[PDB]
């Protein structure tokens, strides 16, 4: 639950 | 009273030699809009500049049909690399707007509050280290230069409905700290809104963040009490037919048509 609140935003494509 | 404007003018129509991905920025981002019906010549916004589109109407005025139409005729002079759409689409009437190649890696389609609040939220975790060094110069801002990658276009359809279903946190709250500097980090918003909810929501924190800056407002079909204005002429139209207003001035265009899927 700290990879967890980025694993949408890190998958993005910036 | 003569009709100078078509009824009806495809996208293709309207744009039947758009420039390709090796144009320049400036040239792939001025985007075809509508026809002019003082001199039948298309309408564009400037979105190298001018970063923001909001389209008013009432009741099946057009406002999905152009959304879908100028969504397209940015991805024909958009690569993947140069664009990604970010859909809020809780009708689920923009689905094939876009081609695959061109949504957002993730997150790109959001049909309810819960499903738009978690992607805005990743989206302006992105966008905010966009955000340029406090020691750029204007050329720099300009080139912007310090970060590399697509501009993000987010795709808002019935803003309204989104504002009416919001559970929580108001929609696009992330998101509002960053549109100052929409131009610097590629974010457009292109969002439609139903014209009898259209004035208020140009006095709030996304909708009426980019009005009030001097973002191009299309006004179709709409009763003249449902947006009081001296300036503007608010009525009703046929179908796509709108009073455009921007900072270079104001005008009755035809907006592009398109084939719903
Ligand atoms: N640019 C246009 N030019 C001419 N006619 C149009 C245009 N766009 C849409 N129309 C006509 O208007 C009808 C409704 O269009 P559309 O659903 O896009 O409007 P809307 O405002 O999104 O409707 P709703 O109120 O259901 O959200 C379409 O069936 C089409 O015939
Ligand atoms: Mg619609």
Same mark, same amino acid.
């Given at each position: ?14 | ?20 991905? &090796? ?11 509508? !026809?002019?019906? $003082? #001199? @039948? +010549?298309? *309408? ?73 609040? &978690? ?11 966009? !955000?340029?060094? $406090? #020691? @750029? +110069?204007? *050329? ?122």
């Amino acid at each position: 639950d700290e990879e967890q609140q980025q694993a949408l935003s890190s998958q993005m494509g910036f | 009273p003569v009709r100078v404007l078509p009824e009806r003018i495809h996208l293709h129509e309207l744009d039947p030699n758009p420039p390709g991905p &090796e144009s320049d920025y400036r040239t792939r981002w001025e985007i075809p809009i509508g !026809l002019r019906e $003082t #001199d @039948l +010549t298309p *309408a564009h916004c400037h979105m190298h500049t001018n970063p923001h589109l909001l389209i008013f109407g009432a009741a099946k005025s057009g406002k999905t049909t152009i959304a879908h139409a100028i969504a397209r005729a940015i991805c024909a002079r958009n690569s993947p690399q140069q664009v990604r759409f970010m859909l809020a689409d809780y009708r689920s009437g923009l689905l094939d707007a876009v081609p695959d190649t061109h949504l957002l890696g993730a997150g790109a389609i959001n049909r309810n509050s819960a499903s738009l609040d &978690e992607a805005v939220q990743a989206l302006a975790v992105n966008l905010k280290k966009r !955000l340029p060094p $406090t #020691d @750029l +110069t204007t *050329a720099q801002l300009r080139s912007r230069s310090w970060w590399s990658g697509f501009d993000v276009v987010l795709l808002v359809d019935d803003w309204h409905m989104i504002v009416g279903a919001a559970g929580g946190m108001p929609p696009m709250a992330p998101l509002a700290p960053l549109l100052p500097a929409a131009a610097d980090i590629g974010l457009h918003i292109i969002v439609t809104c139903q014209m009898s909810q259209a004035y208020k929501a140009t006095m709030d924190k996304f909708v009426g963040a980019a009005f009030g800056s001097g973002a191009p407002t299309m006004f179709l079909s709409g009763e003249k009490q449902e947006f009081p204005s001296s300036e503007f002429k608010v009525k009703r139209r046929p179908p796509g037919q709108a009073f455009l207003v921007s900072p270079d001035g104001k005008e009755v265009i035809q907006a592009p048509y398109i084939e719903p899927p």
